[PDB]
């Protein structure tokens, strides 16, 4: 299949290759699931072809023929990913009612920030994982003062930004 790592031998060095119109999420929604599997592998082989051509263009320092179609193929891949994940999300909402496909909690680390802690699929239960029990999901009364200081740092950046936008508008109204 190395002959399909490279494109058609007639096209080698023609300074422009006429191929356009990347896929669209609507067309991919109209297609099936097995069809989307097959189209993913079509696009994957052609994308490996395009990356090979781009790397060899860098190696020989000659201009890449069709960067726009590598952009199109990455767009096609991302649209197909979006479509399949929409079907997965919708079916997950119907059968389980869960918004996210991986479990988590809203924890509070040592520094007292509130984080989303994504869970991590172990073999022994939580209460006897030694490493997990070394990790800490609570803060302490010195984290208190540091939290106040970080909050006020953000408040200062926000006050700076709003004041500057108003000053910009005022000098603009002087100009016009």
């Amino acid at each position: 299949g190395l002959e399909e790592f490279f494109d058609d031998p007639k096209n080698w060095g023609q300074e422009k290759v006429k191929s356009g119109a990347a896929w669209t999420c609507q067309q991919l929604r109209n297609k099936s699931n097995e069809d989307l599997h097959k189209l993913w592998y079509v696009l994957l082989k052609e994308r490996n072809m395009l990356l090979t051509l781009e790397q060899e263009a860098k190696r020989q320092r000659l201009p890449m023929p069709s960067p726009e179609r590598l952009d199109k193929v990455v767009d096609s891949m991302d649209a197909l990913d979006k479509v399949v994940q929409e079907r997965e999300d919708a079916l997950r909402l119907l059968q389980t009612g869960q918004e996210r496909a991986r479990p988590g909690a809203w924890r509070r680390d040592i520094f007292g920030r509130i984080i989303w802690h994504k869970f991590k699929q172990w073999v022994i239960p939580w209460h006897l994982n030694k490493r997990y029990n070394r990790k800490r999901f609570f803060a302490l009364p010195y984290v208190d003062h540091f939290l106040r200081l970080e909050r006020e740092k953000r408040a200062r950046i926000k006050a700076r930004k709003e004041n500057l936008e108003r000053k910009k508008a005022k000098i603009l109204l002087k100009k016009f």
């Binding site: 191929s19 356009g20 119109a21 990347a22 896929w23 669209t24 999420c25 609507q26 067309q27 929604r29 297609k31 097995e34 069809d35 599997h37 097959k38 189209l39 592998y41 079509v42 696009l43 052609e46 179609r69 199109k72 193929v73 096609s76 479509v83 929409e86 079907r87 997965e88 999300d89 919708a90 079916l91 997950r92 909402l93 119907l94 059968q95 389980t96 869960q98 496909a101 991986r102 479990p103």
Partner: protein, 109 residues
């Protein structure tokens, strides 16, 4: 003494360099000779369809029509899936015995 450079597997003593590793997933387990046992089930299998005799191909025409965006909401999928409930007048209660479980995902991609 660069703090600012990333910490990698190329960047320590011989034990550090042997332990760190890039993000490749494990494929087996190590035992008792420092001998490595690869588990076939832990090795991922590429499921690749047969693409011979196929018409979908990696671009479309510019003569294709324009159509507006409609993301697949759970309500739309619901109605399209159980119009037979209207005809009368599938659902999973739990997911222990299911292979491709939805919420605590069992599958890849």
């Amino acid at each position: 003494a660069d703090r600012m450079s990333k910490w990698t597997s190329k960047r320590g003593p011989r034990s550090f360099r042997g332990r760190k590793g890039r993000g490749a997933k494990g494929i087996g387990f190590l035992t008792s000779g420092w001998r490595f046992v690869q588990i076939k089930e832990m090795v991922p299998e590429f499921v690749v369809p047969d693409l011979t005799g196929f018409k979908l191909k990696p671009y479309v025409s510019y003569l294709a029509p324009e159509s507006e965006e409609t993301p697949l909401t759970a309500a739309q999928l619901f109605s399209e899936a159980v119009a037979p409930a209207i005809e009368k007048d599938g659902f999973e209660p739990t997911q222990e015995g299911k292979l491709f479980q939805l919420y605590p995902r069992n599958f890849l991609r």
